[PDB]
C-alpha cells in the first residue's frame, strides 16, 4: 500500500576539537609559525578568529588556509568572519 | 637585437615591471618605445595617436592610469562642477532624454530645447517648428525627434539647422516612440499601426515598413547594430512581437502571459519583466529571450512585488541590473541566473537604474538619486530633489539627472535637469554641434572669463 516515502537521515560528526584543527595545537596558545620564531620581533597579534559556522581558528592559520582555499575546512561552508557583536 | 624584442614582445606588463631591475641593458630593453606604445594602445589608452608625438611611453602609460584613479576618487567624493538647466517660466517639464551629454527636453507648451553639457559655454536653443503639448522626445548623435499630442512628429537634423527636415502626421495619438541609437531610423506606434521612417539613398525620409498589432502598444525599442534592415521590439499589453523591416515580418516572441512592466534591448538579447498573477499566485519575473532564434534563456525572480525597471544594454558582459517596487535594486548574473547583490536603496518604487564595472546609480519615485559602490559594498552619496526621478545617464566622467512632475519640499520647481562633471579639465569652450552655438560675442566673452576663473583640481 506504500507508494512514496521521504526518509530523513542524521549524520553525526561529534568531534570536540578544543584546539585549532589547522595546526592541532591549543587555541589560546600560539600557532606553529609564531611558536617557531618565538618573540623575535612581535608576537602580540596571534589572535583568534570566529566564523559564522561557529568554528574558531588562529588568525594566521585560517588566513593562510583562505589564501589556499576559500571554504571552511571542517564543515565545507562558505567561510565568513563573525561580525555579530564585534 | 631584434631577437631581444621578439623575446620581450610576448612578455606581459607585470613581469616587464621586474625585468627592468636585473641589468642596465635589460633596463634599456625593458623601456622600449614600441613595446610600451603597443601596451598602451592595446589597453585602450590614447587610441588615435602615433608613437612619434610623445616620448617615454612608459611614463605616459603611468600618467593615464594615475588620471583614471584620480577620476575614481573624484567620483567617491564629490569633486567637480555642477550645473542646472534653468526654469522655463509658467511651464512644466514633460519629457527628457539624453544621448551623449546632449540633453533634449519637452514642455507642456510645445517647446523643445537642447543643451550640450560638455562645454564651458551656455547655449540652450529652442527648436523651431515651422501650441499642443509634447508627448515624447528622443535624441541621437545627429538627429532629434519630437512627438506631440495632436499626432504630429517633427524630426530635426542637429547638423544643419533649427528647422524640421521631416514633418509626419498620424491620425490618432502616439503611444510610443523610438529612435535608433546608431542608425537614422525612427519608429512610432499609433493606435494600431507601428511604422518605421528612414531616408532613402537621396535622403528623402520615406516609410520603410508598416505593421499592425491587435492591442495598444506600451513599449517600443529598436535593436542596436543592425546591418541592413532595422529590427524593432513592441510590447502590446500581454503580447511581445518582433518586427523585421526586411519583408515586414511580424514574429511573436511571447504570448499568453501576464502583462509586461519594462523592456530593454541589447544587440543580441531582450530582457523584460512581467507581473505576478493567479488564484494561486505566481510571482513577478524577468524573462530574457534571444534575438537569434527567439529562444528563452533565463527566467529570474524571487520577489514579492513587481519589477519596474531593468538595464541590460549598458551593463558589463554577463551582468544585468534591475529595480523593483519594494525599492530594492538587484544585480543578476546571466550565466548562473543567481542574484549577486540585493540592495534596499529607496522608499517608493525604483524608476531608473544603471551599472558599470564598479558602481550603481539609481533614482527613485520619491525623488532621490543614490550612488553605490558594489565592489567595496559601500554607499558613496545621494541627492534629494522634488519630483520623481525620470531620467538618469552617466559616463566615466559625467552624470545627467532629471526630476519630472506627474507642497513637496521647500525648494519648489516644475522640472529640474542637472548635470555633474567629475573632470573639469575636459570641458570644451564651444559645442561641436553647429546648432548648439550663438552669435552674441558678449555672452561668449562672459562665459570665457567664467571658465578662466574656475578653480583647478
Amino acid at each position: 500500500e506504500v507508494k512514496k516515502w521521504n526518509a530523513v537521515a542524521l549524520w553525526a560528526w561529534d568531534i570536540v576539537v578544543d584546539n585549532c584543527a589547522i595546526c592541532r595545537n591549543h587555541i589560546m596558545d600560539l600557532c606553529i609559525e609564531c611558536q617557531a620564531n618565538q618573540a623575535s620581533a612581535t608576537s602580540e597579534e596571534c589572535t583568534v578568529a570566529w566564523g559564522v559556522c561557529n568554528h574558531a581558528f588562529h588568525f594566521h592559520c585560517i588566513s593562510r588556509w583562505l589564501k589556499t582555499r576559500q571554504v571552511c575546512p571542517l564543515d565545507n561552508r562558505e567561510w565568513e568572519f563573525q561580525k555579530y557583536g564585534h | 637585437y631584434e631577437l631581444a624584442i621578439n623575446i620581450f614582445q610576448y612578455l606581459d606588463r607585470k613581469e616587464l615591471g621586474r625585468c627592468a631591475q636585473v641589468s642596465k641593458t635589460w633596463k634599456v630593453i625593458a623601456e622600449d618605445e614600441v613595446l610600451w606604445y603597443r601596451l598602451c594602445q592595446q589597453e585602450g589608452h590614447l587610441p588615435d595617436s602615433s608613437i612619434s608625438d610623445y616620448s617615454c611611453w612608459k611614463l605616459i602609460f603611468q600618467e593615464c592610469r594615475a588620471k583614471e584613479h584620480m577620476l575614481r576618487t573624484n567620483w567617491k567624493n564629490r569633486k567637480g562642477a555642477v550645473s542646472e538647466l534653468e526654469h522655463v517660466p509658467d511651464t512644466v517639464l514633460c519629457d527628457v532624454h539624453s544621448h551623449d551629454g546632449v540633453v533634449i527636453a519637452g514642455y507642456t507648451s510645445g517647446d523643445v530645447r537642447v543643451w550640450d553639457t560638455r562645454t564651458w559655454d551656455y547655449v540652450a536653443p529652442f527648436l523651431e517648428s515651422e501650441q499642443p503639448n509634447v508627448s515624447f522626445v528622443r535624441i541621437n548623435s545627429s538627429l532629434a525627434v519630437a512627438a506631440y499630442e495632436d499626432g504630429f512628429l517633427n524630426i530635426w537634423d542637429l547638423r544643419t539647422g533649427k528647422y524640421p527636415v521631416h514633418r509626419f502626421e498620424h491620425d490618432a495619438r502616439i503611444q510610443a516612440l523610438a529612435l535608433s541609437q546608431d542608425d537614422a531610423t525612427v519608429a512610432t506606434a499609433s493606435a494600431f499601426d507601428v511604422v518605421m521612417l528612414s531616408p532613402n539613398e537621396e535622403g528623402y525620409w520615406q516609410i520603410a515598413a508598416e505593421f499592425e498589432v491587435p492591442k495598444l502598444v506600451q513599449y517600443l525599442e529598436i535593436v542596436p547594430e543592425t546591418r541592413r534592415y532595422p529590427v524593432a521590439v513592441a510590447a502590446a499589453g500581454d503580447l511581445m512581437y518582433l518586427l523585421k523591416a526586411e519583408d515586414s515580418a511580424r514574429t511573436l516572441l511571447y504570448a499568453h502571459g501576464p502583462p509586461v512592466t519594462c523592456l530593454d534591448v541589447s544587440a543580441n538579447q531582450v530582457a523584460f519583466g512581467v507581473q505576478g498573477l493567479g488564484w494561486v499566485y505566481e510571482g513577478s519575473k524577468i524573462l530574457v529571450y534571444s534575438l537569434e532564434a527567439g529562444r528563452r534563456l533565463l527566467k529570474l525572480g524571487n520577489v514579492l512585488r513587481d519589477f519596474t525597471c531593468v538595464n541590460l544594454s549598458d551593463s558589463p558582459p554577463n551582468l544585468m541590473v534591475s529595480g523593483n517596487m519594494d525599492g530594492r535594486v538587484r544585480i543578476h548574473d546571466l550565466r548562473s541566473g543567481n542574484i549577486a547583490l540585493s540592495l534596499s536603496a529607496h522608499q517608493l518604487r525604483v524608476s531608473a537604474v544603471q551599472m558599470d564595472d564598479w558602481k550603481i546609480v539609481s533614482g527613485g519615485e520619491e525623488g532621490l538619486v543614490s550612488v553605490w559602490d558594489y565592489r567595496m559594498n559601500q554607499k558613496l552619496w545621494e541627492v534629494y530633489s522634488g519630483h520623481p526621478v525620470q531620467h538618469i545617464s552617466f559616463s566615466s566622467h559625467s552624470l545627467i539627472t532629471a526630476n519630472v512632475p506627474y507642497f513637496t519640499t521647500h525648494r519648489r520647481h516644475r522640472g529640474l535637469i542637472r548635470a555633474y562633471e567629475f573632470a573639469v579639465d575636459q570641458l570644451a569652450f564651444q559645442s561641436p554641434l553647429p546648432v548648439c552655438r550663438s552669435s552674441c560675442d558678449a555672452m561668449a566673452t562672459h562665459y570665457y572669463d567664467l571658465a578662466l576663473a574656475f578653480p583647478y583640481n
Partner: protein, 129 residues
C-alpha cells in the same frame, strides 16, 4: 622538387624544395651544386627540416640546452622562417613569465650587477604593475 644545401660541417642535405621554401633567402637564391650554408651546423638543419615537414597547416622538440636554442633562434634569424622564431620566442616567454628578478637571474645565467641603492630605488617607482 629536390635541392641540396652545403652546410658548415661539409655535409650535403637534400630536401624537397617547395615546403622548405618558407625560408625566403634560400628560395631567393633558388629562383634568382648546392647553396652554401656557412653559419650553422647540421643538427639545426635536420631539426628545422623535420619541423617544417611536421608543420603544414613542438613543445618537447625544444627540451634541450639553452645554447642550442640560441643557435636555432639565430639560424631562423638567418633562415627567415616565421615558425621557428615564433615557437622558440613563445617558449622562452612562457619560461620567463611569472618570476622574480632573481628567478630571471637563475633562468638566463645573468648575474645581478646592480648595486643596492640602485636595486632599492629601481623597485620603488617600477612597483606599479
Amino acid at each position: 622538387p629536390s635541392i641540396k644545401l652545403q652546410s658548415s660541417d661539409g655535409e650535403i642535405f637534400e630536401v624537397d624544395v617547395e615546403i622548405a621554401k618558407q625560408s625566403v633567402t634560400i628560395k631567393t637564391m633558388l629562383e634568382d651544386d648546392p647553396v652554401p650554408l656557412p653559419n650553422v651546423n647540421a643538427a639545426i638543419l635536420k631539426k628545422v627540416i623535420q619541423w617544417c615537414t611536421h608543420h603544414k597547416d613542438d613543445q618537447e622538440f625544444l627540451k634541450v640546452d639553452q645554447g642550442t636554442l640560441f643557435e636555432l633562434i639565430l639560424a631562423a634569424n638567418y633562415l627567415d622562417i616565421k615558425g621557428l622564431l615564433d615557437v622558440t620566442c613563445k617558449t622562452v616567454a612562457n619560461m620567463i613569465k611569472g618570476k622574480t628578478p632573481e628567478e630571471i637571474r637563475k633562468t638566463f645565467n645573468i648575474k645581478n650587477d646592480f648595486t643596492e641603492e640602485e636595486e632599492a630605488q629601481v623597485r620603488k617607482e617600477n612597483q606599479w604593475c
